[PDB]
Amino acid sequence: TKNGRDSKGQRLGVKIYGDQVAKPGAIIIRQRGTKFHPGKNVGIGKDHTIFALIDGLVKFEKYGPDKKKVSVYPREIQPENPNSYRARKRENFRLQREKKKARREGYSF
Amino acid sequence: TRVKRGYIARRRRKKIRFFASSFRGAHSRLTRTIAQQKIRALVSAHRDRDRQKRDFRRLWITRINAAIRERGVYYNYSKFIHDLYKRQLLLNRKILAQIAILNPNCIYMIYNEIIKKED
Amino acid sequence: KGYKMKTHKASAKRFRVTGKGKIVRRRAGKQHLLAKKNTKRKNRLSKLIQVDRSDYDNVIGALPYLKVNRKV
Amino acid sequence: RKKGKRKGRGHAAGQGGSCGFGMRGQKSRSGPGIMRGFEGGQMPLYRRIPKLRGIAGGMRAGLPKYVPINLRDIEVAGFKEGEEVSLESLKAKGIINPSGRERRLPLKILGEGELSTKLQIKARAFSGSAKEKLEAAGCSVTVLPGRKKYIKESVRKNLARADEYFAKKRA
RNA sequence: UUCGCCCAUUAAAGCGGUACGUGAGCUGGGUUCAGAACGUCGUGAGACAGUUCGGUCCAUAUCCGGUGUGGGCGUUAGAG
RNA sequence: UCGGAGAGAGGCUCGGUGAAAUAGACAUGUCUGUGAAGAUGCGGACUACCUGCACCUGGACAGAAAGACCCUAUGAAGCU
RNA sequence: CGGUAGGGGAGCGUUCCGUGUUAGGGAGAAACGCGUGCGUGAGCCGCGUUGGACGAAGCGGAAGCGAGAAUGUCGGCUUG
RNA sequence: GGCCAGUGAGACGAUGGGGGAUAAGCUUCAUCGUCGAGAGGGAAACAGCCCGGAUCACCAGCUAAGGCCCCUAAAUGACC
RNA sequence: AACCCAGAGCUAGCUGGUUCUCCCCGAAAUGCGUUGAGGCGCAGCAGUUGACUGGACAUCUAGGGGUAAAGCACUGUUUCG
RNA sequence: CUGACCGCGUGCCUGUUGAAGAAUGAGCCGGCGACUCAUAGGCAGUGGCUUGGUUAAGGGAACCCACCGGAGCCGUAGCGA
RNA sequence: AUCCCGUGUGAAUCAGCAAGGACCACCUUGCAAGGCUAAAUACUCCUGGGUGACCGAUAGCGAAGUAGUACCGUGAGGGA
RNA sequence: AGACAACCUGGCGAACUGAAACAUCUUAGUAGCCAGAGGAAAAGAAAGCAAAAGCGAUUCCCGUAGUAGCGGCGAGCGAA
Numbered sequence A: 001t002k003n004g005r006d007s008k009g010q011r012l013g014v015k016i017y018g019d020q021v022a023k024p025g026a027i028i029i030r031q032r033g034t035k036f037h038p039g040k041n042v043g044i045g046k047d048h049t050i051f052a053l054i055d056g057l058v059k060f061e062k063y064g065p066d067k068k069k070v071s072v073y074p075r076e077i078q079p080e081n082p083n084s085y086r087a088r089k090r091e092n093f094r095l096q097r098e099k100k101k102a103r104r105e106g107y108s109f
Numbered sequence B: 001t002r003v004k005r006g007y008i009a010r011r012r013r014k015k016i017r018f019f020a021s022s023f024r025g026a027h028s029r030l031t032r033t034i035a036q037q038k039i040r041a042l043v044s045a046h047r048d049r050d051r052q053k054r055d056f057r058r059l060w061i062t063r064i065n066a067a068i069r070e071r072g073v074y075y076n077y078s079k080f081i082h083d084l085y086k087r088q089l090l091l092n093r094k095i096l097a098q099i100a101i102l103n104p105n106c107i108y109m110i111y112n113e114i115i116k117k118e119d
Numbered sequence C: 001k002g003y004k005m006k007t008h009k010a011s012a013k014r015f016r017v018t019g020k021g022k023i024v025r026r027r028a029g030k031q032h033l034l035a036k037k038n039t040k041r042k043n044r045l046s047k048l049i050q051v052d053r054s055d056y057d058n059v060i061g062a063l064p065y066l067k068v069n070r071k072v
Numbered sequence D: 001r002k003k004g005k006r007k008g009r010g011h012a013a014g015q016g017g018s019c020g021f022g023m024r025g026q027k028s029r030s031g032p033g034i035m036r037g038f039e040g041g042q043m044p045l046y047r048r049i050p051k052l053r054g055i056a057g058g059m060r061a062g063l064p065k066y067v068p069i070n071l072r073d074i075e076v077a078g079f080k081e082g083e084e085v086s087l088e089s090l091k092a093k094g095i096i097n098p099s100g101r102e103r104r105l106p107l108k109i110l111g112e113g114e115l116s117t118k119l120q121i122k123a124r125a126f127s128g129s130a131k132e133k134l135e136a137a138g139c140s141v142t143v144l145p146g147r148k149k150y151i152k153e154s155v156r157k158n159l160a161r162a163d164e165y166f167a168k169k170r171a
Numbered sequence E: 001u002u003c004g005c006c007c008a009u010u011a012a013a014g015c016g017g018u019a020c021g022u023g024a025g026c027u028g029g030g031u032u033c034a035g036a037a038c039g040u041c042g043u044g045a046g047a048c049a050g051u052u053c054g055g056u057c058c059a060u061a062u063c064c065g066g067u068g069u070g071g072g073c074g075u076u077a078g079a080g
Numbered sequence F: 001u002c003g004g005a006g007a008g009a010g011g012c013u014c015g016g017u018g019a020a021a022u023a024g025a026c027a028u029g030u031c032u033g034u035g036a037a038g039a040u041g042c043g044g045a046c047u048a049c050c051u052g053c054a055c056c057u058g059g060a061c062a063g064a065a066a067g068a069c070c071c072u073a074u075g076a077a078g079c080u
Numbered sequence G: 001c002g003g004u005a006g007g008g009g010a011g012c013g014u015u016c017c018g019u020g021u022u023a024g025g026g027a028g029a030a031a032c033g034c035g036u037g038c039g040u041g042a043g044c045c046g047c048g049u050u051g052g053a054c055g056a057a058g059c060g061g062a063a064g065c066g067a068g069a070a071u072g073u074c075g076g077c078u079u080g
Numbered sequence H: 001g002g003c004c005a006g007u008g009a010g011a012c013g014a015u016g017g018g019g020g021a022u023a024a025g026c027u028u029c030a031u032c033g034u035c036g037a038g039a040g041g042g043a044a045a046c047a048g049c050c051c052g053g054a055u056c057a058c059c060a061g062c063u064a065a066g067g068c069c070c071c072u073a074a075a076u077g078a079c080c
Numbered sequence I: 001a002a003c004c005c006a007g008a009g010c011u012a013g014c015u016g017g018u019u020c021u022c023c024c025c026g027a028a029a030u031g032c033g034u035u036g037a038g039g040c041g042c043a044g045c046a047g048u049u050g051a052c053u054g055g056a057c058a059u060c061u062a063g064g065g066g067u068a069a070a071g072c073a074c075u076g077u078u079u080c081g
Numbered sequence J: 001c002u003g004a005c006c007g008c009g010u011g012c013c014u015g016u017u018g019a020a021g022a023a024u025g026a027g028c029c030g031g032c033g034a035c036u037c038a039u040a041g042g043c044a045g046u047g048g049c050u051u052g053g054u055u056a057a058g059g060g061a062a063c064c065c066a067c068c069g070g071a072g073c074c075g076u077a078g079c080g081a
Numbered sequence K: 001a002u003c004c005c006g007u008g009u010g011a012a013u014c015a016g017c018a019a020g021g022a023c024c025a026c027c028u029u030g031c032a033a034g035g036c037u038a039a040a041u042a043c044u045c046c047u048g049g050g051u052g053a054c055c056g057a058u059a060g061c062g063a064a065g066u067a068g069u070a071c072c073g074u075g076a077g078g079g080a
Numbered sequence L: 001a002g003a004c005a006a007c008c009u010g011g012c013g014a015a016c017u018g019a020a021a022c023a024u025c026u027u028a029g030u031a032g033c034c035a036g037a038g039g040a041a042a043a044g045a046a047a048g049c050a051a052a053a054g055c056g057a058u059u060c061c062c063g064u065a066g067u068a069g070c071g072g073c074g075a076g077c078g079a080a
């Protein structure tokens, strides 16, 4: 008859993607049914909310042959770049803040 | 402490009126109108100090085109100028206009140098 | 005898301050209709929460004698 | 002394014309505003939140009943050995300035910091850690009597009948 | 009332535009103003894209525009 | 129909006395185009010596203030 | 280094108070009128064939402290 | 984080669409540009299209968009 | 529902007005709620003041997706055989 | 000082998505004419003390003001109805 | 609770009575149903002295002259 | 007996307003009106405070304190 009723969008969908970082407890996906399946190091909720049990990179996989599942793997961060563009500019900012604050009270006259 | 406005107003008004001397009609009389008219005057002035720099180049170029067109059948302003540059001369358009009027023979010579060299 | 500001009383029966100077309040909704609220939710509605930065103005404005640090 | 804005004079100055009230409507209109705690007619924040625990019914508010002092303060102060601390001698050196409500109060000692001296202390009360640290440092702790609570005779008979029971039982 | 119908003619009794072309040119209705009555709705006060009888719009032309009617000055000396 | 003449009171000229509503400033053409979508004032053409007087009322969204009609206001009052 | 609502900085002026019964002033003060003067401007500094007795600068203080709009408002004077 | 403002009527244009008649200078959303709050040039004139973002002086010079018969700056240029 | 005075400078989320100069920065017309719709609260986006920071503009790789296109494997729909 | 002739040049305010508007307002001129005061709260800027800070009313050679006046008040403990 | 009043009922005298924030016990404090009394405090139609970061003829009182006058209103009242 | 500016006591006693409406509440026992007396009036010599320690008629100022509380527990009111 007469239309025009509706619902606020529920905020469902992927919260963290593949190869991003997760905290323990961090929600990876809110879904209605299961459009994904829990993998390893990964718990599932009552509403089929998928959440991480472990810090690390989250990876999506073929559940096979058709469906998909998500699991979390622990990563390793050793490789801090000692000398690179990133390091160079961030350092530069530090040292410029230091210098520019030190040449104030160090002003004669 | 009560303060009458006193002359603080009338001075301002007067110093505006001085501005607007020789405006026809009620533009030279009534304060309230005079105000506006001052502003507009100042405004045009500012505008046309910019227009000015446009208009004399207008003019100069025109006169130059006239001055050259006399010599060759096929000669222009455009041609001329292009020729002045590929011959590496610095003279700007004011000077070529004033030399066009006030020393015509000179411009004939210049043309003869550009011609000799383009030859 | 001048006029001194009055504490807005209906605001002071609601908000108070912690020793370090932040404002706190109760949470709304644990009064009736509890049976149909799960225990977990009920626990969450039992605790004391620091008021949202947003409202700090209105509150502060109506409780002038509340000693409050906004952490400056 | 920074010179004040005089609103409504000139534009080039400052807040001229409107004065910084922008265009129209309630906030630019002369007169008392709208109440500080009020949002548009939506149920105001303070009204949609429940009243604080005890206050809400008329259970009396909690009030300080002693003037708390740590041992920190008694260390920093100029107390030489043997000296009486009490209440009075803490006003003397000023480390406590009592106001009306505080005047009418007793004194209580709270352990913090480690006292080195032998002092003679008088107060109506001590925390556990307090008198522990005090009797550990060799200080004499005088506990002053509070004012007797008046009791009618019948309740003395009851409370004494108790003590007679305990006494006949242990002996 | 736009519309339209008829009478008697007529060469023919065109259709549109111009703020209903035209209310500081004129006049009826319409904005159904206040009174009253009928039908109808409403317990009611009152109502009606119902009907009915009664029912106040002024104006010395500044400028433009116009119809006439002059002066001044020009028309290279002045006139008829 | 279909207007005509005449008499008075004005109108008109001369002398005397002498207001008013109005009014941003006004050196105040027409067509057409444009534009807050109907322009003396912006554009393009066209037409226009300067200035009176008598007449005429098409324009200046002419003049005489809250629009009676419609809506708003947590306005006002009367009535049920 | 465009700029409305709007925020911030730096200034100018008016009348009064302190310094102060000040400097100066019937050898002409305030004011009024003028400037080939100086300022980014508000304004300042200089000058008077006016005027006829008061009153700066500096360093500070205070406000009945700056007008073109309110169908503002009171007087004056026009237009018609 | 602190202190303390306005704003909460938007307009068209490009694009994706819905309502409507794949009508409206209509209406309602989405991602952008300009106007709002932006002058200059091009567009006959011409908020929203194109170029470009105005500290200020110069009777200097080079260009953008756009143009080079006359009004009106530049070719009455060349070759198909 | 008279007049005159007083409460009264009533009240007006409405309309009108709001006066000197220079310098710097500079918006919004959106969301939610509202006896709300031309008002207001909070958020969003100004200014000024601090505390932390290391980015932005580019370049490439990696994620999940179900639009444009496309399709008849399902759900409808449809023509003829 | 005047101004032959050429070019450029759509009064001001208010208020709007937007105005030269045929949108409002002003006949003209000169005056009067609007974010003020008191008392508190918060924040900033300056001082003064930090042997913690400060006085209120009150008294004062009339005022101001020396010198008093610690009653109060702010900071030194929190948690909890 | 205490305090004070309409209607109606209605005690006790110190071995009492009232108060101590419903009420009862206990303790503490006080003695209603009869009166009267200065100062510290409020005010300006005024009187006498004093001062003024108060006005100076649109200001200051409505009023520096016939001012509550002229004038207006039946009157209350307005009012230069 | 009448007159008498403000202040004061007693008696009658509003409403606009605030609460973003309004009815309890607020405005406020305010204005107004009536009556009365004084240079002040009123209050005043504990049938009072307090809390297990004490005070010693009334009035007024500072403070406690925007605290305890009261309140469509809203607007607000607000002690000792």
Ligand SMILES: [Mg+2]
Pocket (backbone or CB within 6 Å): A007, A008, A009, A010
């Ligand atoms: Mg949905």
Ligand SMILES: [Mg+2]
Pocket (backbone or CB within 6 Å): A046
């Ligand atoms: Mg479970």
Ligand SMILES: [Mg+2]
Pocket (backbone or CB within 6 Å): B002
């Ligand atoms: Mg004066």
Ligand SMILES: [Mg+2]
Pocket (backbone or CB within 6 Å): B003, B005
């Ligand atoms: Mg003034």
Ligand SMILES: [Mg+2]
Pocket (backbone or CB within 6 Å): B022
């Ligand atoms: Mg000239």
Ligand SMILES: [Mg+2]
Pocket (backbone or CB within 6 Å): C019
């Ligand atoms: Mg604390």
Ligand SMILES: [Mg+2]
Pocket (backbone or CB within 6 Å): C031
């Ligand atoms: Mg419960």
Ligand SMILES: [Mg+2]
Pocket (backbone or CB within 6 Å): C057
């Ligand atoms: Mg705020």
Ligand SMILES: [Mg+2]
Pocket (backbone or CB within 6 Å): D004
């Ligand atoms: Mg101020």
Ligand SMILES: [Mg+2]
Pocket (backbone or CB within 6 Å): D005, D013, D014
């Ligand atoms: Mg400023």
Ligand SMILES: [Mg+2]
Pocket (backbone or CB within 6 Å): D017
């Ligand atoms: Mg203005």
Ligand SMILES: [Mg+2]
Pocket (backbone or CB within 6 Å): D019, D020, D021, H005
């Ligand atoms: Mg403001």
Ligand SMILES: [Mg+2]
Pocket (backbone or CB within 6 Å): D023
């Ligand atoms: Mg305005």
Ligand SMILES: [Mg+2]
Pocket (backbone or CB within 6 Å): D021, D022, D023, D024, D025, D027, D028
């Ligand atoms: Mg506003």
Ligand SMILES: [Mg+2]
Pocket (backbone or CB within 6 Å): D029, D030, D031, D032
């Ligand atoms: Mg108001």
Ligand SMILES: [Mg+2]
Pocket (backbone or CB within 6 Å): D035
């Ligand atoms: Mg209030």
